Structures are given as C-alpha cells and as structure tokens.
Predict the structure.
Amino acid sequence: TRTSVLADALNAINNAEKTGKRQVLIRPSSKVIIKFLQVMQKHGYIGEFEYIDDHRSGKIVVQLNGRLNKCGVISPRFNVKIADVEKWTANLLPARQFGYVILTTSAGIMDHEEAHRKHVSGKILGFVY
Amino acid sequence: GRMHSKGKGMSSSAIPYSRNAPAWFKGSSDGVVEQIIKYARKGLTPSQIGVLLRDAHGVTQAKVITGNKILRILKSNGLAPEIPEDLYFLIKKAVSVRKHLERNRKDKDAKFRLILIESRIHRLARYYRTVSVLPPNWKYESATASALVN
Amino acid sequence: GKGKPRGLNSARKLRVHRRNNRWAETTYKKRLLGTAFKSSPFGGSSHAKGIVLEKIGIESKQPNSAIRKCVRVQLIKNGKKVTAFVPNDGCLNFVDENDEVLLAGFGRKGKAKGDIPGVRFKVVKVSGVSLLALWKEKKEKPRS
Amino acid sequence: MENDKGQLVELYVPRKCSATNRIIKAKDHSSVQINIAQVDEEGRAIPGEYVTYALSGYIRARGEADDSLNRLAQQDGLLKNVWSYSR
Amino acid sequence: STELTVQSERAFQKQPHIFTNPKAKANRKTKRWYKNVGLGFKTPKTAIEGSYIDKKCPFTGLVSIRGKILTGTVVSTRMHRTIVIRRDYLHYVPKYNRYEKRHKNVPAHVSPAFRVQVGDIVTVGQCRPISKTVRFNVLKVASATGKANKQFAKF
RNA sequence: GAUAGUGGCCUACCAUGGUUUCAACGGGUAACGGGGAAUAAGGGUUCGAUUCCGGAGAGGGAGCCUGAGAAACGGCUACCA
RNA sequence: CGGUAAUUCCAGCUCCAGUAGCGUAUAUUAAAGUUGUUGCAGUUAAAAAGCUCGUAGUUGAACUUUGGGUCUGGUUGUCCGGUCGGUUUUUCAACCGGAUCUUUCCUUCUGGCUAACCUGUACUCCUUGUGGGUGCAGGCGAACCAGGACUUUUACUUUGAAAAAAUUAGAGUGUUCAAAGCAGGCGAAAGCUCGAAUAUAUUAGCAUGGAAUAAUGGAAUAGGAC
RNA sequence: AGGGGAUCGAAGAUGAUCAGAUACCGUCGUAGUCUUAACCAUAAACUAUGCCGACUAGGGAUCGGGUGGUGUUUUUCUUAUGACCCACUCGGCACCUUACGAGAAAUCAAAGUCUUUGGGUUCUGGGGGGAGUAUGGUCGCAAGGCUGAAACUUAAAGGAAUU
RNA sequence: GAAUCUGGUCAAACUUGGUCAUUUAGAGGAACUAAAAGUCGUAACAAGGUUUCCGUAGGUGAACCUGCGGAAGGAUCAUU
Ligand SMILES: [Mg+2]
Ligand SMILES: [Mg+2]
Ligand SMILES: [Mg+2]
Ligand SMILES: [Mg+2]
Ligand SMILES: [Mg+2]
Ligand SMILES: [Mg+2]
Ligand SMILES: [Mg+2]
Ligand SMILES: [Mg+2]
Ligand SMILES: [Mg+2]
Ligand SMILES: [Mg+2]
Ligand SMILES: [Mg+2]
Ligand SMILES: [Mg+2]
Ligand SMILES: [Mg+2]
Ligand SMILES: [Mg+2]
Ligand SMILES: [Mg+2]
Ligand SMILES: [Mg+2]
Ligand SMILES: [Mg+2]
Ligand SMILES: [Mg+2]
Ligand SMILES: [Mg+2]
Ligand SMILES: [Mg+2]
C-alpha cells in the first residue's frame, strides 16, 4: 500500500535533490501534492513543474533548482493550534529565521508564516528547510 | 502486492489514453449492446462476454463504445447473476477443493490452500454485504456453498 | 517506520505499549510492585535502628585484603538480621555488644559496597551518639 | 548576511557549482574550477577572457560529471549538438 | 417501541389528569394529550395518530427534555421500549498528541412514536431520570430507511 | 410503596436483558480527589497526608432522637473491641 | 590506594571547594534519546514470533469550482516633514479583508419598515449648468425582526464565553534592599490622588467564523428532483 | 495402538586404547529408523535481516513468461514449427564492482533515503547472573510447551575490529 | 399517655463452615549465588588434540557422551 501520497511525492524529490537530479517523476500526484508544490514555488524552492493529466490518476514531473535541502512531510497530520505552530517551527526548521512549515488550513495549504499572518492554522503537512 | 503469496506480480491489462471511440473501428453502439445481451442469454459471465466482444468483434471496452459498463448493461436488461461473478467463481473453486479434500484425507497443502480460498471468500462476502449485493447476514462456506454453485 | 504507529487515532496502542515496556526498567518496577515494603530489610526508610547482636569481622573481597569489622544487627521494626559495617579505625571500642544502633544505607541504592561481601549498611548513631562524633571525640559515649 | 543597516558580514561567500547549485564547500578537496577559452578566427584564443565553470566535488565523485559539463557548455554556447535534452 | 396490545398490564393504564367525557358526542372518542417537545424537533404524528400510553415518552407523557441533546448509533434494541445508543468519540492523550476511539453506551428510553432498528443514528435528549441507568429519551431516529424501499438490484 | 422529590430506591407481576479485548468483572494500591509541588529548552516525569476547594471519618460496626439542616459522635441507643 | 620512598590510611602542615552553613543515608526529578509522541534499539552487542491465515485495532489511490478581472477598506514602510520629538495625504508597493459578475447564488417565503433611488410628479433657489433636493400614486429588501419550513453528520481550526482564589508568569510600587506585601504617592507640608493590572493553564461541554485536511451520506426496482 | 522390521543404529552388551574410558575407534544389538491411525509445536525452525509500499547506481550472468529480429540452424522442395543467437522487457533466486549513503565496525543497493530525526503497520529488548528457574495459570496420555517472577548477586557481561 | 406486648423492619453482633492474603513457626527437602592457595577430571577457547553449536531422546562421578535432524556462530565464500 502507498498509504500516503504526499509522503511518496516528497521522498522521491528529496532523493533526487540528494543525488543532484534536475528532475523528478512523481507517480500518483494529487490536488494536495500540487498545492504543496505551488507553495514551494511561491518562495522559490522548486522550478517549473508539469502535471501530466493521465487519463487515470496523475503524474508530476518536477524541475529542481538545487535550492532544496530537505522536504519533509510529517507522519500523522497533527492538528495544530496557533501556539503549537511556534513549537513545531522551533523543532522542524533550521532557524527562528527562514524556511517554511507547510500546514494545511481551512483557508488552504499555506506555509506557516502566511498562516500566522492570516491568523489561521490547522493540520500540518510538510516543511521545506 | 498479491493477496496471498509472497509473489509480487505486475502482469496486468493496460488501458488506452482515449476515453473516446477508436475512430475507424465501425459498427455502432446498439449492435454492441445486442451482442452483449445475446452473450448474456447464452450463459456467459461478464468478463467472458467482454473477451468475446474484444477479439472476434470490433470492441475495445464496452464503456468506450456504449457509454455504460458490461455489468451495468446487464443490470439494466435484468440478466446479471445473483452472486457476483468473481465471488461465484471463488465459491466454485472452494467447492472443488472441498471435494478433493473429501477424497484425500492426508493432503495438508490442499487443506491450507482451501483455508486461503475460504478467507478470500469471506473478504469478498463482507464487501458484497457492505455494498449490498448479497442480502445481509448471508455467509458462504462449506455446506450451503455447494448448493449455491448450481 | 519502525514499531510505534506514527498513527493519529493510534494512541491507546501507544499508551498500552509504553505501560508494558516500562516494567523492564528496574526502578519503576521496584516502585510499582512495592519491593521496598515486602523486602530489602529497611521499610523503604533511610535509617533504621537495630540491636548489636554479634560483632563479625567479614573477610573482604578480592584484590583487597583485610577484615571488615561489621556487626550482625537485628532490626527492631521488621526483625531482620542484617550485617551493618562500622566505619573508621576500630570504633567497635564504641559499639560493644547488645547495644541499640542506628544504621544507614551505603550509597549504592541498596546493593553491595566496594569490597565488603554480604554487607549493605553503615552504622551511624551508636546508642544515640553517632560514630563519627565518638571517633573524633567531638562528643562522647553515655558511660554504659 | 547583512547587519541591519547595510554592512555585509559572512565572509568567504561560497562558490556554488554551476551544474548542481550545491554549495562548493571550504575543504572541497574534490571540486574543480573549469576554465574554457573565449575564441576567435585565425590563431586567436583571446587571453584573459574565459567562460568559466565550477563543478562541485560530489557530482564528479558520483561519476556523472562529463555530461553535466557538456550541458553547461551547450547552454553558454561553447558547444552545439554534443549534448541533447532527451536521452 | 411497545408493538401492539395497547392495554395489557395487570393494571389498566391511561394518561393522568386527562379524561374522556362519556356525556359529550365525539367520533374520535378518546382525547389524546400530546406535547410539543420543542428544540426544533417535529413531534412525530405516530403519537397523535397513536393509541399507546407510555409514561416515559417525551410527547405523550410527563417527561420533558432539558439540558443535553446528543446523537449516536443504536447498538441494541433487545429490550422493551428502550434502546442502547453508543456515542463514539475521540479522546485525546497529550503525551502522544493523539486519539482514542472511545466506547460509552447511553441507554435511552424510546417512545413507540418511532420504529428503531439496529444501526440507526438517534438524536437523543436528556431528561428526568427514567430508571437506574436510563436518563435519555430517543427524540429523532433521523435515518428513515437507509435503503429499505430500494434494496433490490434488478431494474 | 417509599421519599422533600426522580428513580430497582423496595415490593407485586411480566419480559430477558445489561457490561465486556475501544479491557467489563475481579485483584492490588505502601490511592482521599482536585487546585497544585518539585523539577530551568521542547515534549515531559515523578509528588500531591499539608495552609484553598470538595469528600469521607470520629475506636469499630450499627441504630436513631431533636431540629431548617445531623444518621451528629465535645447527642443519645445497643453490640463488639 | 595499603606487601617498609603510601600524592589515596592515620596524624601535622600548607591548600581547594562551599560557607552560617556543609556533609552522610534513602527516595525522587534532571542528567536518561538508559522507556524514546517529539526521540531509542532488534544481522552479529538484548531483542524480528517457525510460518501463514485471520477478527477487533491501527492505516488507506486519486477524483468533485479552478481560475481570472472589476471595484472597494484596513498595515507597514518608502518620500518629505505640512509642523512648536510627533502629525497626514498624494508618488508607491507588498499585505490581509470584503463586494462582485463571470458558464456560478446566500436555506426559503409569508409582512413588517422599505433606507435610498431603478425612480419622476411640478420643475427650479440658482455661476450661461446633471454644482443642489423639501417632495407623493406603480416599485431594490438584507439595514434585522418573528414566524414557519428543514436543515447530511462529525473530527479539525480561529475568535468568543466561562476554565474560584492562592500558587506560576507578569504591570506598578523604595518591604533600608531582598524574599515579600498590596500598597503607597504628592501638596500651602491649612486634603487630593492613582491603585490593586494582564496572561496562560489547550483537555469535556457551549457559542461563532473557516471550509483545505480526514472521514461520512445523498438520484441506478429511482417510492429521485422541481 | 496396529502392522513392516533391510540397513543403520539411543540403550545395552563387548573388544581394545588409556593412570582411568559404562568416551572417542571395532563387533553384535532391542527402541527407533519406514508406515497407517492419532498426538506433541518445538530447532542455529538462520538470510541469525517482521511484513507492505515508494525511491535512489551501475553491471553482466542465471531461471520463469512475453514481444522485436528477411539472424543462425534442423530440410521432408518454399517451409511451418522447435533448439540456439542478438536486443529488450516484466517476475524471481542470487551474485560482482563501486559508495556518491549507511553503520560502532565487520560490512550493506539495502542494514540506504535518520539530529536535515515523521510512508503504514505487527511484534520483541532494556547491564550481566539468578533464570527461561520458582510459583500460578493453562494446552499436553506423559516427556513437555506457551506464558514467566522476585529475592538475592556482581562492574562488568557483551559486540566488531587491531596489535 | 407510662412501662409492657403481638407483627414487621433496619439490623450490630454471636455460633458455624468454607475462600483468601499479609505474616511468622517450617520436622525435612533440593536450589542459587558470594567467598575462589579445597577434591577429581579437563569440558570449552588453537582442527583445544572426537570442530563447535542448536532441537530432541537415552545414558550416566562430574564436566558430559551418544543417537537422529538441523545449523555454521567452521577449519570450506573454489571445479570447465
Ligand atoms: Mg493522586
Ligand atoms: Mg491534596
Ligand atoms: Mg497515609
Ligand atoms: Mg483512637
Ligand atoms: Mg462535632
Ligand atoms: Mg455516629
Ligand atoms: Mg610517607
Ligand atoms: Mg533531555
Ligand atoms: Mg538503548
Ligand atoms: Mg543475540
Ligand atoms: Mg510571583
Ligand atoms: Mg572398555
Ligand atoms: Mg556403550
Ligand atoms: Mg523458539
Ligand atoms: Mg529467530
Ligand atoms: Mg534483563
Ligand atoms: Mg581433528
Ligand atoms: Mg577439551
Ligand atoms: Mg574438543
Ligand atoms: Mg551471540
């Protein structure tokens, strides 16, 4: 079973970045994955990326900038409570400063800074530092 | 990765990118439907019907040509079996295995395989119960299974 | 992912697993079973008074050699016959026979100390004067 | 990076590899500067002016380095035909 | 639930302080007293059209719904005029930051204003302590059929 | 029926439920429960007889009288210690 | 360490630590990522069930409105200070929010109430006039009532309310300082003053906004919708 | 509990050898070794590597299937098949190099993608002895198995390498 | 309306038997450690002088040996 799909997407990407591939192929590829990728793009971590409309499930081809370091998805989607956010960022990100915790909220899949600004948080998906 | 062995096969039928009809391959839809119904009348079971359509006639997948599935079509015309095709086949297999076991008292491997078959049947039974195709609190096993087959 | 369901509605399994695991840790087990009250001479107390039954020089463990000037002590509260070591330069010249004697642990969370075999406790307050005090003559013995 | 009111800190601003954008480290006793000469008609190899690359140790170590260099060349117009997008 | 009989006890039962005058002419004969329970519930017609008495009913009795109103699936119908709802919820252990599928069974008295079958969700209400354990009255068996008129597969 | 009042609270009669591996019931507790205490990243562990809030209990079991309010113990009534 | 030069014993001497304290014993927390949710190990250091099935449990592909513009308010800096260290618009953006049409409705109407114009009945006080509206007959509802109908249901999450005090963190304040306490402080030294702040304590409820995430369900003998 | 009882062979004999040998070696030899009914559930039951799933690095081999070859070859004319051959390709059982990753190391394409810690899940471990013991459950016709302590007790017991 | 008395009723208690647990007696029985200048062998570590081990059954001063089947943690990563 490919239980979680976001996880799978990120893992392959991570591997690619580690080797120094400039491109990855992600097998199943959801709404969620696409949204995550968009978020990453918005802060310039990922290059262009192309979702193949398979007349089936999906397929994503990514272009890597080499600006990625580690993209992690956290295992259960812990429901997270606006103050919890701070704790998570302290744990998950290499500085009080930069990089992003990519939490899904009611307002959409944002990073963490955006969520804080918007003043809304929810479950966590990933992170990008 | 295979429901019962340690084997991890990936032999599988693929599908074409086009949901649209394959252009030149003529006939119609009505004709296809008629053919399907004829096959149903003759006693063939869904998969078999599909196979027959594909090879001899100008068929790729009934979904592409007619619009609706094979099973759906059957249901519409009211010719579909009472116990779902796969499940029925499983039951038949189980019956066969049971028969074998009756004859051969010492055949441990066969018994083991029978157990697996039974488990599979149970799974299938459960899912049919959930989607309501087998009327609830109907269990399929050893004594009544034979009766059910034919 | 290794063991533990990194699940989310997983929690009961986790909690139960932890409970089950804990028992292998010694301290926790001791706390829970209540080894302190059923066994280990003292009532899980720091100090216990006992009575100097008989002075025994216990012959020490290996590399080291000597005789270790301990006391078989019968505790009052439980009635258990321990062997409590006595510190410094004799000081059995203070202990005598059939005296009330306050004992301590040794520093080893029960168990054995250094090189003295089958010994668990120091003596501190003999008859109610404390051994150190007697030895360094900062306070002195109540006659008899 | 910058100390508030301008004023750049953080010295030794890392070379990044041209192939991978992966930082060329301080003791990259594996990495290289590749220098390729800007060139002109009849003799002429124009001293002083090069098109330059840096290749980080890691790619080279992996083995796939030549192809990366080719790619770099084809982009900066130091080659044509040699290396294609599709393989 | 009750199911038929109407007037079969050692005693003979009626709604209290509600009385049918033999003197006056009425084709309806018996005057039923009902109660609009409130709280946005439509009081089932199968009480007003009904014939049973039943003292622990929220509509045709002195029991009145206050305080908590909960929902949940019916596990057990196996005893007379009452039901066992199983209110299942997720309780949180912080040490792991995660959850438990927790059980708990609410016994609720059921007015025969309802046909309640195993597996049906029930908006149940709190009330005056009915008996021993039962402190709730079934108010809305919201699942009306759940595929009962359309069970057959054939066209 | 009882009660201040609801209720298996008890009685009559009828039915056969209810709880449970999403730990029932047992057995333990060197368990009064919180508020809290110590512990100095984050999560936490232990500890809470004790200054506040509840709850029991007045040697143990009972039983009651008076009174708005006690099943009171610096109030009785036994019985056992 | 100690078997005749003991840096560990017993003494003296200097010395070191802490100091009106300091040591010993037993717990216990930290150290203990040696109990591991964060966060441990399992080929060989202990540890992967002999193997498979299987019920609970946990976990579960992807998919259902994504987009663009239009207009309208906030908050930071930019650029000057227009000013006797602060002040607000234009030049400017990012930033959240709202209203919209787009092929897109917000649960729906019985009547209150229409508030203003989709309005025009006379037209003009009046800068040669869309500068400006007192005004009553057809008719915008959201500017919210009360009254029905019937709301797929949750988990989330924000805001809110209650989470007794003390304790904890924390605002002020010269208990001589400090722990503290809740006071105090200021005049002509011929009565006036601030004060006793806030904030957590997530958990089970309760109210509200959000609709991604994760469920759950509707129309397939349509006894389906209007 | 029956049969069948060739060979080998726990026990036993019995010969040496040895200070000694009901041990190693020699020669007989029941039980057993086959097998039908039943049981027992253990093994270094070992790949000492839980099962699923995804991805990252090449390489030939080899087994199973499957296409692509005016390919060789069998000739009974063209042949059509088989057996090879070459290129693939799934699936497997492994193996060889590299480590760019691991790991304590030995080593490992998994023991990788883990302090840059989070795919899903079972189960098991918590210094060594005591001890897989005692007791209690149980399941066994018994032998036994599954579960399984503590008291004590000790600063090591271990691994993997090096001299 | 006093003692008193019939019926309940709550019922302390008391005589009985049987479960349990903390405990201390425990006639005797086998264990285990700590002590490691006893006694006998030398079992294991070298192919440890029969390679060791596992599971099992039998035997016996004692380590143990021997069947049968497995391992290598072997002393073999090797035959056109
Ligand atoms: Mg407590
Ligand atoms: Mg308390
Ligand atoms: Mg106490
Ligand atoms: Mg007393
Ligand atoms: Mg009193
Ligand atoms: Mg009393
Ligand atoms: Mg000297
Ligand atoms: Mg820590
Ligand atoms: Mg460890
Ligand atoms: Mg081991
Ligand atoms: Mg304070
Ligand atoms: Mg002999
Ligand atoms: Mg012999
Ligand atoms: Mg085993
Ligand atoms: Mg094993
Ligand atoms: Mg242990
Ligand atoms: Mg040899
Ligand atoms: Mg030997
Ligand atoms: Mg040997
Ligand atoms: Mg070993």
Notes: The domain at 1-87 of chain D is CATH 3.30.1230.20 (Hypothetical Cytosolic Protein; Chain: A;). Chain D has one domain: 1-87. The CA atoms of residues 38 and 81 of chain D lie 19 Å apart. The helical segments of chain D are 57-62, 66-75.
